[PDB]
Design an enzyme around this catalytic site. Structure first.
Site, short mmCIF file in Angstrom:
data_model
loop_
_atom_site.label_atom_id
_atom_site.label_comp_id
_atom_site.label_asym_id
_atom_site.label_seq_id
_atom_site.Cartn_x
_atom_site.Cartn_y
_atom_site.Cartn_z
N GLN C 142 0.83 -1.21 0.00
CA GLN C 142 0.00 0.00 0.00
C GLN C 142 0.87 1.27 0.00
O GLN C 142 1.87 1.34 0.73
CB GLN C 142 -0.92 0.03 1.23
CG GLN C 142 -1.20 1.43 1.76
CD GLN C 142 -2.14 1.45 2.97
OE1 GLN C 142 -2.11 2.40 3.78
NE2 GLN C 142 -2.98 0.42 3.10
N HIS C 144 1.12 5.83 -0.28
CA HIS C 144 0.53 7.12 0.08
C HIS C 144 0.52 7.99 -1.17
O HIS C 144 1.50 8.01 -1.92
CB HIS C 144 1.41 7.85 1.10
CG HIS C 144 1.32 7.34 2.50
ND1 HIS C 144 2.23 7.69 3.47
CD2 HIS C 144 0.40 6.55 3.11
CE1 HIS C 144 1.88 7.15 4.62
NE2 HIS C 144 0.77 6.45 4.43
N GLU C 171 -3.59 5.38 -0.34
CA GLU C 171 -4.12 6.23 0.72
C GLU C 171 -3.76 7.70 0.52
O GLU C 171 -2.62 8.03 0.19
CB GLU C 171 -3.56 5.75 2.05
CG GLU C 171 -4.05 6.44 3.30
CD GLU C 171 -3.25 5.97 4.50
OE1 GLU C 171 -3.74 6.09 5.64
OE2 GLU C 171 -2.12 5.48 4.29
N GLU C 222 -9.09 2.51 6.48
CA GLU C 222 -8.17 1.78 7.34
C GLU C 222 -7.87 2.45 8.67
O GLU C 222 -7.74 1.79 9.69
CB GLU C 222 -6.85 1.52 6.60
CG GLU C 222 -5.68 2.27 7.17
CD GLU C 222 -4.39 1.97 6.43
OE1 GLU C 222 -4.03 0.78 6.33
OE2 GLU C 222 -3.74 2.94 5.97
N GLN C 297 -3.92 -2.31 11.10
CA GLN C 297 -2.74 -1.59 10.62
C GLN C 297 -1.92 -1.25 11.86
O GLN C 297 -2.33 -0.39 12.65
CB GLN C 297 -3.09 -0.28 9.92
CG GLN C 297 -1.82 0.47 9.46
CD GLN C 297 -2.06 1.89 9.01
OE1 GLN C 297 -1.28 2.44 8.24
NE2 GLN C 297 -3.15 2.50 9.48
N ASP C 336 5.45 3.04 6.98
CA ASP C 336 4.91 4.22 6.35
C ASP C 336 5.33 5.57 6.91
O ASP C 336 5.05 6.60 6.30
CB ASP C 336 3.38 4.13 6.42
CG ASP C 336 2.88 3.91 7.83
OD1 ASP C 336 3.68 3.42 8.65
OD2 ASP C 336 1.71 4.22 8.11
N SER C 363 2.32 -0.15 4.72
CA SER C 363 0.90 0.20 4.79
C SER C 363 0.93 1.72 4.62
O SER C 363 0.22 2.47 5.30
CB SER C 363 0.25 -0.24 6.11
OG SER C 363 0.52 0.65 7.19
K LIG Z 1 -1.53 3.74 6.11
#
Ligand SMILES: [K+]
Ligand code: B12
Lengths: 181, 132, 552
Positions: C142, C144, C171, C222, C297, C336, C363
């Site tokens: 995942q 950003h 995200e 999330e 998460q 992240d 994440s």
């Molecule tokens: K995240």
């Protein structure tokens, strides 16, 4: 000329349209005096107020004792401001412009990276806050961001919050603060 | 068998009754299919509920079944009940009235007990609205 | 006198900028086994845990009571808790014991037991265990997508480039709250331009995000936060009951979502109850289980600066990842957030999860330069892409990303830059000049993006949220704009809510909008000879990086 803070019993919600309340953390300018980057609370508090007046409104300083969370702090300011627009600020510097009727963890503007705030910004924060109180739509203060602030200050930020959170009083009413120059 | 999509999706229905096979780009354009349609039916949630418990993930199956009871409730009412469950927003009588609505107006039996439990917990742990 | 030059050079070393501190248990400033953490224990009377980790039901706090009545298998706990912590650690690494076997046990233990189990392991063991407890068999990733100016043109573009790079989850978030709708929109449009099937979220205030989802502007959530102490939960403006109801709220709409927690949150907010970071996080992951939420998460996440400051903090991050996994939850394992000025240090932190693999190694990998990362920076950003690819090739470890040609990306960024431009026309939003679509296609970050009339935008946003815009309105604007393709892709995303397949543990989507989760892609690692192994096709892709010269 040094701006210091003065206690004043109990602050009450008002309905004086031309005001913007600025609520400061339990320890702001009392148990603590500088931010994470050692900036005097007075010069900051001076800049905020000057920003408001500069737009014609009045700015009344209060101290939120019920919480150390700037979000709630700012929310209290707003739900106490006859204009519905308030500002919250922690001792370490974190600041937010809220509106009485947004949810607590939401806001109008946010300055989540304390160490990057300058007196100039604190001044523009005051202007925008007043422009909101006058039901205007001011272009928000340009957000700033530095990927290494957390690595540099997060740990420190925590400690400052530990010190100011020690001065939180369960259910206590917000106290009015007088501006002595 | 799983996924439910691939395996016999002719019987997968939105809460409105429209088949999954109707959610076409043209029907959305023709105005036929609308925002209230692209949603999940309690039948579908009951299916995943089963898939999960057969994976020993009962806890999630319980959530799905809990979610099923909430499909009929309006979006704005969901937001209201959620906000009301937040710290200090409600009094014991107000949460208990919501439990009453949930049980008898929405028949969300499990959600009603959930709320009556929060009421009790907020009471013990002092999380009910300020005072009166 | 005189000083050593050797020590002057070191003193100037970047790593020496990182905030490290000695342990201070009283205020929760310690990674593991704080002298104040409780001893694991449990007792059941007539089907109700009457004692939990040294505390009798009488003194349960909201969290205790919630975990005791929702997160622990009351029938098997008594017997499970009879096993020594070390014995579970041993099964965690035993190639003869299976994933399902330990699940039956761990879902029957307590927050203190889980932490006590981690205390018995080195990182190698945790990594070993991790590659087996992971829910989905194939590791994912995942990223950003954000920028200093909450600029929609650049978001759409970036989301496309991120998707072609491999991220299955994207995200976004915002500098100015009021910009959310726009950001969620461009992310949605952009995401389908790069790789159809990409899931997308917009991390904002809980109630505001649930509404964005209800309006079909996002496909998952999330950052539905959970905390380890009452005091903090309150400052977070939630309770285990309100947060559990919120979870069912999302599912009741057919939306996929997970909780967010992480070591160090409670201490940074001032109420650790003088507990260690991992213990408190332990309670968080059990709240996640008990609520019925499929994924979590964690791994310090936003508070990496905290857990990273103290001793064995990074080992702690890994440990919290494992507790979540062995507890049978999907795990988006952070990586992240920024925490160090050193490449050496930040790499070791990530390697912990990359090497073994998790449902989502990162994440929140920044798909844009960190100066643009509105999450205050990620552990790895866009300028690291070439390195991350070389690592995968170096160690034969699928990191969940592939290399891309300048041409493929320039084109993908243009298609998405135009696509969003068209959407703004049709919806009557502040125009996106061609010079903007231009800038965003060959841009690196918001430094190459001409300004926009914020006031104008914000004003329009408000107007849009009044007009009650929906994802379906976006579908249309795309069809009437010539981009039938993206329109049908967004529609397929929304369709997910009907089947409810992407609600299962570790669920994601492929190019054909088909679900791939821990249900139809079970992890089955049992030592060499089993479990995941990069496929021939995938290995060829990892190896064949642009620029590798043929030796001859
Ligand atoms: K995240
Ligand atoms: C660390 C962090 C967190 C941590 C720490 C919170 C705390 N109170 O100590 C945790 C995970 C717990 C958190 C939670 C939330 N966060 Co946060 N957070 C950050 C992050 C990544 C870094 C901030 C930082 O380290 N600054 C450096 C230090 C040295 O400066 P500081 O001034 O002392 O920083 C403080 C503020 O940033 C403050 N703060 C953190 N989050 C928020 C949110 C709001 C609304 C406010 C007023 C203040 C605030 O926490 C820091 C305390 O050290 C920022 C990203 C960014 N662009 O800054 C997001 C960010 C600020 N968070 C955000 C949000 C929305 C939230 C939540 C409301 C989310 C939710 N689902 O409920 C919650 C709850 C807020 C609360 N009660 O504090 C948004 C704000 C968007 C906006 N309104 O413009 C951001 C930009 C992005 C994101 N989603 O991750 N957050």
């Amino acid at each position: 000329f040094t701006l210091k803070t003065r206690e004043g019993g109990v602050a009450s919600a008002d309905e004086r349209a031309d005001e913007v309340v600025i609520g400061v953390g339990p320890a702001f300018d009392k148990h603590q005096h500088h931010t994470l980057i050692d900036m005097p609370h007075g010069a900051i508090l001076k800049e905020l107020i000057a920003g408001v007046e500069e737009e014609g409104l009045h700015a009344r300083v209060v101290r939120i004792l019920r919480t150390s969370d700037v979000s709630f702090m700012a929310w209290d300011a707003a739900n106490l401001s006859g204009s519905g627009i308030g500002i919250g600020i922690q001792s370490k510097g974190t600041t937010v412009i809220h509106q009485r009727d947004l949810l607590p963890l939401s806001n109008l503007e946010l300055f989540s990276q304390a160490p990057l705030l300058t007196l100039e910004t604190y001044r523009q924060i005051g202007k925008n806050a007043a422009r909101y109180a006058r039901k205007e739509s001011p272009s928000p203060v340009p957000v700033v961001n530095d990927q290494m602030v957390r690595p540099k200050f997060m740990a420190k930020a925590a400690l400052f919050h530990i010190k100011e959170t020690k001065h939180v009083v369960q259910d206590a009413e917000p106290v009015t603060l007088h501006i002595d120059l | 068998d799983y996924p439910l999509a691939t395996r016999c999706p002719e019987h997968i229905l939105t809460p409105t009754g429209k088949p999954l096979t109707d959610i076409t780009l043209e029907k959305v354009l023709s105005g036929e299919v609308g925002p209230q349609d692209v949603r999940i039916s309690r039948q579908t949630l009951e299916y995943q509920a089963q898939i999960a418990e057969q994976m020993q993930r009962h806890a999630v199956a319980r959530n799905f079944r809990r979610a099923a009871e909430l499909i009929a409730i309006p979006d704005e009412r969901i937001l209201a009940i959620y906000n009301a469950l937040r710290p200090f927003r409600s009094s014991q009588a107000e949460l208990l009235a919501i439990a009453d609505e949930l049980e008898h107006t929405w028949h969300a039996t499990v959600n009603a007990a959930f709320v009556r439990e929060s009421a009790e917990v907020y009471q013990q742990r002092h999380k009910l609205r300020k005072g009166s | 006198m005189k000083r050593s030059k050797r020590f002057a050079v070191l003193a100037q070393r970047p790593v020496n900028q990182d905030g490290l501190i000695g342990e201070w248990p009283e205020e929760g400033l310690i990674a593991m086994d704080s002298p104040f953490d409780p001893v694991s224990s449990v007792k059941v009377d007539n089907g109700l845990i009457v004692e939990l980790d040294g505390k009798r039901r009488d003194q349960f706090d909201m969290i205790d009571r919630f975990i005791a009545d929702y997160a622990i298998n009351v029938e098997r706990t008594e017997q499970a808790m009879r096993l020594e912590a070390v014995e579970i650690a041993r099964m965690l690494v035993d190639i003869h014991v299976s994933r399902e076997e330990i699940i039956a046990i761990t879902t029957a233990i307590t927050p203190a037991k889980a932490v006590e189990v981690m205390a018995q392991m080195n990182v190698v063991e945790m990594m070993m265990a991790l590659q087996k407890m992971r829910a989905r068999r194939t590791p994912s990733n995942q990223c950003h997508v954000t920028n200093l100016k909450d600029n929609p043109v650049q978001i759409a573009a970036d989301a496309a480039e991120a998707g072609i790079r491999g991220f299955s989850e994207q995200e976004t978030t915002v500098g100015i709250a009021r910009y959310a709708p726009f950001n969620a929109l461009a992310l949605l449009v952009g995401s389908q331009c790069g790789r159809p099937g990409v899931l997308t979220q917009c991390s904002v205030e809980e109630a505001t995000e649930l509404e964005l989802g209800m309006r079909g502007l996002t496909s998952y959530a999330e950052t539905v936060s959970v905390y380890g102490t009452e005091a903090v939960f309150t400052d977070g403006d939630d309770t285990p009951w309100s947060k559990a109801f919120l979870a069912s709220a999302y599912a009741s709409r057919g939306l996929k979502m997970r909780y967010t927690s992480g070591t160090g949150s409670e201490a940074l907010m001032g109420y650790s109850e003088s507990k260690s970071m991992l213990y408190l996080e332990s309670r968080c992951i059990f709240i996640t289980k008990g609520a019925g939420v499929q994924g979590l998460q964690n791994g310090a996440v936003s508070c990496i600066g905290m857990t990273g400051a103290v001793p064995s903090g990074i080992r702690a991050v890994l440990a919290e990842n494992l507790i979540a996994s062995m507890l049978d939850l999907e795990v988006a394992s952070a990586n992240d957030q920024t925490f160090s000025h050193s490449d050496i240090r930040r790499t070791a932190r990530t390697l912990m999860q990359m090497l073994p693999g998790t449902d989502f190694i990162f994440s929140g990998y920044s798909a844009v330069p960190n100066y643009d990362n509105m999450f205050a920076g990620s552990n790895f950003d866009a300028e690291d892409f070439d390195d991350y690819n070389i690592l995968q090739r170096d160690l034969m470890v699928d990191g969940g990303l592939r290399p891309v040609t300048e041409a493929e990306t320039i084109a993908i960024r243009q298609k998405a830059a135009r696509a969003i431009q068209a959407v703004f026309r049709e919806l009557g939003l502040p125009p996106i000049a061609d010079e903007e679509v231009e800038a965003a296609t060959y841009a690196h970050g918001s430094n190459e993006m001409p300004p926009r009339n914020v006031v104008e935008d914000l004003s329009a946003v408000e107007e849009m949220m009044k007009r009650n815009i929906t994802g379906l309105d976006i579908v249309g604007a795309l069809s009437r704009s010539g981009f039938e393709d993206i329109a049908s892709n967004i529609l397929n995303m929304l369709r997910q809510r009907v089947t409810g397949d992407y609600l299962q543990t570790s669920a994601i989507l492929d190019r054909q909008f088909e679900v791939v989760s821990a249900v139809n892609d079970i992890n089955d690692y049992q030592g060499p000879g089993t479990g995941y192994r990069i496929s021939a096709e995938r290995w060829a892709e990892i190896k064949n990086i642009p620029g590798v010269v043929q030796p001859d």
